[PDB]
């Protein structure tokens, strides 16, 4: 299975769409994961059954609290993996996302906590984007900065 | 899929049994991968169909050369992963094999080659077993020391 974990990739794709300011719709998942329209619909309904998302009136997709927690954790592993691959392993930049897209599905939280120490409390991926879920991971808390 | 890559796990199980000097039999896979007798027997039949193994006249399994090259590459990834996990990431030794068991299925050859440099030309896993396939990786040559 090229996606490694299909469910986690539907979750991470919906999260991507949210960071991008794009409406999370099935058609976007089909495009980005190279799956047919009906396959996406069936996977999505199975995830709804599983309590990972809701399919709204207008057909837009919404992560549930359960689905959102899991999406965050995958994206956290993804960006920690990219940090590792660039900062420590020295994998060229143009190859790190593809690699991280596999590793995000197999990294334990224990490794993530080690990576947070080894990488010196990283807060962003190599590509500038914030790493989510660090509070839930147990390594950080959030302060407010007033502008 | 808890095996991450089922075929690769069958390959590496068969390979393990050959490292231990025991006979790789359909039965033996079922026990180590906690799989149905039928599931093993079926996957084994399927991998045979795909040029990965041959069932010998006495039922015992032997990897083709295609299958053996793949098993070595998985094992090589496994052991480099375990060395990364202990040496750089600092995950406890008690937990690295189970983590490496997943990561061995998603690591690219490019990452392996970087890991060889980063871990300073490793030749064994953290547990003293030789890393196979480093010549095929392209990073080493072999020489003989006469005893
Ligand atoms: Ni990425
Ligand atoms: Ni992925
Ligand atoms: Ni191991
Ligand atoms: Ni494995």
UniProtKB/Swiss-Prot annotation, chains A, B:
This is Iron-dependent repressor IdeR. Metal-dependent DNA-binding protein that controls transcription of many genes involved in iron metabolism. Acts as a repressor of siderophore biosynthesis and as a positive modulator of iron storage. Also regulates expression of transporters, proteins involved in siderophore synthesis, iron storage and transcriptional regulators. Homodimer. Belongs to the DtxR/MntR family. Residues 3-64 form the HTH dtxR-type domain. The gene is ideR. One of its GO terms (molecular function) is DNA binding. Its main location: cytoplasm. Disulfide bonds: none annotated. The chain holds residues 2 to 140 of 230 of the full protein. It is found in: Cytoplasm. GO terms for biological process: negative regulation of DNA-templated transcription. Keywords: Activator, Cytoplasm, DNA-binding, Iron, Repressor, Transcription, Transcription regulation. One of its GO terms (cellular component) is cytoplasm.
